Amino acid sequence: CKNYKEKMKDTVQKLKNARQEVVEKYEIYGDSVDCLPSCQLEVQLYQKKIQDLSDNREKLASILKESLNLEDQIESDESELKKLKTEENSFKRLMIVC
Amino acid sequence: SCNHERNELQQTINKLTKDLEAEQQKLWNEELKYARGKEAIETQLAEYHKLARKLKLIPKGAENSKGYDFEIKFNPEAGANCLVKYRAQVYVPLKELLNETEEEINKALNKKMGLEDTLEQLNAMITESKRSVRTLKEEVQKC
């Protein structure tokens, strides 16, 4: 009677021990799953910053682009004025030699 | 004793065996959730690295990287906050490129507006010079 009863006494402890091992591993994965939300959020913030960097680099290039175009306009307009002021002075002289 | 005990021990075996099965199920379940949760992070990281390579923050020595290492490595099973620890490696140099950009944008916009006012000044001077030339013109021809 003690032969089988001990076997059943060992079987219960073998079962209770196995249960304890599965619960342990389950809790490790439970904790790991609980941390992935923070990992997901972090990658989101990095994607935002990279997208922000991309957009602002485009903005800078556009401003520098048009700023160089305005420099060409100032250069041209400075020629037109130079010509006009030369014509203005010539006619002031023509008025005298009338 | 020979039956009451033995039989009671048996029912415990039956219960505990089903309890173990339930825990084996829960472990496998949580393992697959973690795997799906991972893959979702690797997918998002692939999108961040794809764009980083486009902006040439990556690979190492890329021309827009300023010598920083913007690559992020997610490895199976890492301590609480695997990726938050990268804040010093990747996040603070990134916000640096961002603020250097916005400052450089403000200096460029400062220069632009200066050139713009110079142009309106010239339009004013060119328009008044054209008036004078047209006026002196008529007066010369009036003689």
Residue numbers in the entry:
A (entry chain B): 1 to 98
B (entry chain A): 1 to 143
Authors' text:
The bridge between centromere-associated kinetochore assemblies and spindle microtubules is the Ndc80 complex (Ndc80c), a heterotetramer, conserved from yeast to mammals, with globular elements at both ends of an approximately 600 Å long, largely α-helical coiled-coil shaft. Closely paired calponin homology (CH) domains of Ndc80 and Nuf2 at one end, augmented by a flexible, N-terminal extension of Ndc80, form a microtubule-attachment module. The coiled-coil shaft of Ndc80 : Nuf2 has two specializations—a kink or hinge at about 160 Å from the globular end and a so-called ‘loop’ at about 240 Å. At least three interactions involve subunits of the DASH/Dam1 complex (Dam1c, consisting of Ask1, Dad1, Dad2, Dad3, Dad4, Dam1, Duo1, Hsk3, Spc19 and Spc34), which coordinates end-on attachment of multiple Ndc80c rods around the splayed plus end of a kinetochore microtubule.
To express the loop region of human or yeast Ndc80c, as a recombinant heterodimer, we cloned codon-optimized synthetic genes (IDT) coding for Ndc80 (residues 370–509 for human Ndc80) with a TEV protease-cleavable 6-His tag and Nuf2 (residues 252–347 for human Ndc80) into the respective multiple cloning sites of pETDuet-1. To facilitate formation of the Ndc80-Nuf2 heterodimer, we introduced four cysteine residues, two on the respective N and C termini of Ndc80, and another two on those of Nuf2. We obtained crystals of the human complex in space group C2 (a = 49.9 Å, b = 72.3 Å, c = 80.1 Å, β = 98.56°). From merged datasets that extended to a minimum Bragg spacing of 2.0 Å, we determined the structure by molecular replacement with a four-part model based on the AF2 prediction (see Materials and Methods for details and for controls to eliminate model bias, electronic supplementary material, table S1 for data and refinement statistics, and electronic supplementary material, figure S1 for representative density maps). The final model agrees well with the predicted structure, consistent with the strength and robustness of the molecular replacement calculations. The Nuf2 chain is a continuous helix opposite the entire switchback. The short, disordered segment in the human Ndc80 structure corresponds (in the predictions) to the segment of Saccharomyces cerevisiae Ndc80 containing the substitutions in a seven-alanine mutant shown to fail in the transition to end-on attachment in budding yeast. The two structures reported here are both examples of using AF2 predictions to generate hypotheses for constructs likely to yield informative structures. For example, to design the particular loop construct that yielded the structure shown in figure 2d, ambiguities of coiled-coil heptad matching would have required a series of alternative pairings of the two chains on both sides of the loop itself, and the pairing C-terminal to the Ndc80 switchback is in fact half a heptad shifted from the best guess we had made previously, extrapolating from the structure of the four-way junction.
